[PDB]
A = this chain, B = another copy of it.
C-alpha cells in the first residue's frame, strides 16, 4: 500500500464515505476520510490557487485555496510528518472524474523544500517551478490519463479534442526526483507548494476533485481509484 499525505480539493460530496455535504478542501492522512475539512465555494470555470505549507517546528500542515475577489477556504491539521512519511518521497498532483466529470487542468505548479541542519550554513534545498508544461515534459512522471502540452497546460484527466471532460478518468503528475522531506539531524525542514487550476464542468455536478500529494517514491495509481478515491486510495476506509 502506498503512504499518502494529501490536500484534497473535493468537488463532489460522497456522503456515504464521510464527505461533508458540500464542495470542500481536506487534509488526508493515509485515508480518503479527511482528518479535517473546510467548506469550499468552488467556482466553476474560474482559475483558482492553492497554497500548501508545512514546517517541522510547528508541525502544522496548512492549505489555502482562493479565487481572485472571493474569500479563501483554509484548513490546518497538526501532524508530525516524520512519523507518517518515509524520509525520501515523490510529490505530485492527482485528479479524477467518475459518473460526473470536470476538466482538472493545472496551469502552474511550484514547490520548494528546505532542510536546514544543525551546523548552520548546511541547508539542502530543492525548488522547481512550472509556469508552462510542454508536450514532452521529461521531468514529470505522468500516470493514468494525465497529459501535458495542450495549451501549455497539464491535463490531469481526459478531455476531448473539443474540450469536453470524460467520465471515469484518473491521472497523476509526480516530479521526477525523489524529495528528502525530513531527516533526523535537521533543525528546520519546511516545504511549500502552490498550483493554479481550472476546474469546469458541463454537467450539473462537477466531480471528483484535485489533490496535492506526497507519497513513497514508487507510488502508482491504485486499482479502482477513479471517482471518489482521487487516484490516491485503494479503498474508502
Contacts and interface: CB of A to CB of B under 8 A. Distances in A.
Interface of A: 47-49, 51, 53, 55, 57-58, 60, 62, 64, 66, 68-70, 72, 74, 76, 88, 108, 116-132, 134, 136, 138-139, 152, 175-180, 183, 187-188, 190, 194, 196, 217
Question: Which 4 residue pairs across A and B have the least CB separation, nearest first?
Answer: A49-B120, A138-B178, A177-B177, A176-B177
Main secondary structure of the interface of A (DSSP, over half): strand
Contact of A187 (B72, B138, B177, B183): B72
19 contacts: A49-B120, A51-B57, A51-B116, A53-B190, A58-B60, A58-B76, A64-B188, A66-B187, A68-B120, A88-B139, A120-B196, A121-B121, A121-B196, A122-B131, A122-B152, A126-B127, A138-B178, A175-B177, A177-B177
A76 B57 contact: yes
* Number of identical monomers bound together in the oligomeric complex: 4
Chain B CB count within 10 A is highest, among A72, A119, A120, for A120
Contact of A55 (B53, B123, B128): B53
A33 B196 CA distance: 43
